[PDB]
Design a protein around this ligand. Structure first.
Ligand SMILES: Nc1nc(NC2CCCCC2)sc1C(=O)c1cccnc1
Length: 294
């Protein structure tokens, strides 16, 4: 804008573009996101003003919300790296387990807070998880799937990642619960551990089937109500479940146990962020500093 000097493009979302920018005045360096319209639905404009009050050490702070000229600009505190780039940078050696554990622990604290305040993230992915030199990791880019309804995509079109999407969303459940964020985090935890996306689907059905091939095609026994889901088809192939020992080696039993609870098919059986924080896997959690090359 006129009060911000754009340093560079931080990212191109399907719904908005993100810039690293300096407040010509406060001298502060921030992440500026301009959102796409007739005047942007006020229904969200009030929903956004809510996230502004949602402050926690593991949630990227929303500093300012500026509504003007058909554009909505979200001003966020700036962090230097995201988890996707960090994992790519650590692919050769892998992120040390104590750091993986610290990150998972902090993200769960962030979610327990969001969830206790009736706020769902809805689109957790490594790219939306920001880290700094002090060992913190923060939830970013929350709601963008509840504002502009269900539009086409984006200008020149960009492929949305389905890899972290919960099965109930893929099966057409219209009402997401806090459980979809736990699922996404479980997928991310597995990914930090194996250094490979857990369910790299390239279509909604391929995403769903990759989940079924690994966790077994769900049925009424493991997921009461699943065969009544909107997009469920009796014709889905029936795959047996694989052993977690094979899915996230060499993760220890404490980790595999927590992961299995984060990946339960039934949203109602899936562990809550709060309960996950009490899992034995975090008995020896610490806060290591990552090796960040900026
Ligand atoms: N606060 C913040 N800092 C960023 N720094 C970036 C991180 C990657 C490397 C360059 C600096 S991105 C970002 C976001 O709020 C954000 C993130 C994803 C999607 N939409 C918004």
């Amino acid at each position: 804008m006129e009060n911000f000097q754009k340093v560079e493009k931080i990212g191109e979302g399907t719904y908005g573009v993100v810039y690293k920018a300096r407040n010509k005045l406060t001298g502060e360096v921030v992440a500026l996101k301009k959102i796409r319209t007739e005047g942007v639905p006020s229904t969200a404009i009030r929903e956004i003003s809510l996230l502004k009050e949602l402050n926690h050490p593991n949630i990227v702070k929303l500093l300012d919300v500026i509504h003007t000229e058909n554009k909505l600009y979200l001003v966020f505190e700036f962090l230097h790296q995201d988890l996707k780039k960090f994992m790519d940078a650590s692919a050769l050696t892998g992120i040390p387990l104590p750091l993986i554990k610290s990150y998972l622990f902090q993200l769960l604290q962030g979610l327990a807070f969001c969830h206790s305040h009736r706020v769902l993230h809805r689109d957790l992915k490594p790219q939306n998880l920001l880290i700094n030199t002090e060992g913190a990791i923060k939830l970013a880019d929350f709601g963008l799937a509840r504002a502009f309804g269900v539009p086409v995509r984006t200008y020149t079109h960009e492929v949305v990642t389905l890899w972290y999407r919960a099965p109930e969303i893929l099966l057409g459940c219209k009402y997401y619960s806090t459980a979809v964020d736990i699922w996404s985090l479980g997928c991310i935890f597995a990914e930090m551990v194996t250094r490979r996306a857990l369910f790299p689907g390239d279509s909604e059905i391929d995403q769903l089937f990759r989940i079924f091939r690994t966790l077994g095609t769900p049925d009424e026994v493991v997921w009461p109500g699943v065969t009544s889901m909107p997009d469920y088809k009796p014709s889905f192939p029936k795959w047996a479940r694989q052993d977690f020992s094979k899915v996230v080696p060499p993760l220890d039993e404490d980790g595999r146990s927590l992961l299995s609870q984060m990946l339960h098919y039934d949203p109602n059986k899936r562990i809550s962020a709060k309960a996950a924080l009490a899992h034995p896997f975090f008995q020896d959690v610490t806060k290591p500093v990552p090796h960040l090359r900026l």
